[PDB]
Structure 1
Amino acid sequence: AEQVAAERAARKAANKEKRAIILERNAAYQKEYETAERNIIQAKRDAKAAGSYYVEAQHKLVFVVRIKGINKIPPKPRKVLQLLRLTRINSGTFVKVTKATLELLKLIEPYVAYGYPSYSTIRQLVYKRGFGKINKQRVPLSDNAIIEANLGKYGILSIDDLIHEIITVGPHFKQANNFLWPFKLSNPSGGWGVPRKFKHFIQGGSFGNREEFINKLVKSMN
């Protein structure tokens, strides 16, 4: 009976080969990201000198966290909260931004706070609190071959592969997203900064789309 170090070799050298792919991958998004970001910075600059006005793409992806508790909630939004997997207070999911969900988002402002995640807070969510739905079982990520076994189907054989398919709303965002078990944040660390929460953000409260700021909030609840 060989296997001892033979088949140990046959894998350990192929577990090597995967990490090779992952490195070469993650290194690529990095270039894609910063180059994609420098583009906009020069796009805005280029218009200003030209005279004009560079209006960005509307955001394509949203992160929603449920603010309001569990009880005394009216039937309709009480339904949408479920279909967004936001069934408990301070948990929180990503949502791809399209009309047929933008209406959903509308339907439940009084109870969620939401807005536009950064790569930095998508990173720090997955890494720290991202779990998988693997025959339910809410499974912590913690190794790259947990992902690969289930999202490897559609590409995605690394944790940062997850992040990439999320943060770009790429072709498989439905199954990449739903793979992630609804997030589970704490109450914000600093506190909320409002005095009363259940007003709109614009009206000095905490709910609805606060956009770029959904981050600082999240990075305090994480």
Structure 2
Amino acid sequence: AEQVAAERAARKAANKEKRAIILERNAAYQKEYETAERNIIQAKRDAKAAGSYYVEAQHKLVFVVRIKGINKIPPKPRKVLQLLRLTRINSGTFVKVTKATLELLKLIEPYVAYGYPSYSTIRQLVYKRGFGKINKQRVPLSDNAIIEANLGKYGILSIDDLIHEIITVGPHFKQANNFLWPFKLSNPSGGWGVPRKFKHFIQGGSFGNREEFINKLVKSMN
């Protein structure tokens, strides 16, 4: 019973088919991302050419970052922040956009900054600060074996599969999002850009919905 060569070679081969499946899946995801965004651009161009207006779909995903600290919070926004898992300043979470979640975001408007994340900032968040919740422990991802062990029941095999499930809000978004530990970001590297934070972003402050400017803030804080 040598047991160090045959099983090792079988394990290496099995990893080779796993790597091939991950490679072709990522090729398909890249193709569908670029065709989707180019189709949106061409649809806007054709609407302009025909003289109509192209109203694009409302975004189905937000990223929410807690901005205010933990002292002096009223109980209803405090409970909503605990239910959205924002128990620390500079902590972020993806939220699927629904009326039921928009009412929570309206409740905790003065203590968060949220917006519509892009593929680049989602990829940078999961790649740099990527932590899974494995039997109530915070485990860094760092290898696809962890992700296919814990989310492989729901089809997710790799980190880019998890990224795809986040960005295209699929059938198992809830499972993927609860598998993801809340993101612990730092303070922004270039500052907040405003002299005073706790006004609305429309008022020249920081809280509220900076609907597409959240990518700059999150990339500075990440």
TM range (shorter): over 0.9
Q: After the TM superposition, which residues 86-125 of structure 1 pair with which residues of structure 2 at under 5 Å, given as runs?
A: 86-125=86-125
Q: Following TM superposition, where does structure 1 have runs of at least 4 consecutive aligned residues deviating by more than 3 angstroms?
A: none
2: distance between equivalents of 1:15 and 1:213?
40
- 1:184-218 CA-partner distances (Å, limit 9, x unpaired): 00000000011110010000000011011011000
- 1:23-60 CA-partner distances (Å, limit 9, x unpaired): 00011100000000000000000000000000010000
1: distance between equivalents of 2:164 and 2:157?
11
- CA shift, 1:86, in A, is 0.3
- CA shift, 1:166, in A, is 0.2
- 1:70-96 CA-partner distances (Å, limit 9, x unpaired): 010000000000000000000110000
**Unaligned 5+ residue runs, structure 1?**
none
SS, match of residue 64 in structure 2:
strand
1: distance between equivalents of 2:78 and 2:72?
9
Q: State the partner residue of 1:21.
A: 21
SS, match of residue 2 in structure 2:
coil
2: distance between equivalents of 1:105 and 1:173?
18
Instruction: Report the TM-score, using the length of structure 2 for normalisation.
Output: 0.99
- CA shift, 1:136, in A, is 1.4
- CA shift, 1:137, in A, is 1.1
Q: After the TM superposition, which residues 112-151 of structure 1 pair with which residues of structure 2 at under 5 Å, given as runs?
A: 112-151=112-151
SS, match of residue 195 in structure 2:
coil
- CA shift, 1:153, in A, is 0.8
- 1:165-190 CA-partner distances (Å, limit 9, x unpaired): 00011010000111000000000000
1: distance between equivalents of 2:4 and 2:191?
56
Instruction: Report the TM-score, using the length of structure 1 for normalisation.
Output: 0.99
- CA shift, 1:4, in A, is 1.8
1: distance between equivalents of 2:26 and 2:209?
31
1: distance between equivalents of 2:199 and 2:4?
65
2: distance between equivalents of 1:81 and 1:162?
24
Count of aligned pairs: 222
2: distance between equivalents of 1:168 and 1:83?
23
SS, match of residue 133 in structure 1:
strand
SS, match of residue 153 in structure 1:
coil
1: distance between equivalents of 2:2 and 2:153?
32
- CA shift, 1:3, in A, is 2.3
2: distance between equivalents of 1:221 and 1:133?
22
SS, match of residue 101 in structure 1:
helix
Instruction: Name the Cα RMSD after superposition.
Output: 0.6
- CA shift, 1:161, in A, is 0.4
Q: State the partner residue of 1:6.
A: 6
2: distance between equivalents of 1:67 and 1:41?
34
1: distance between equivalents of 2:117 and 2:24?
25
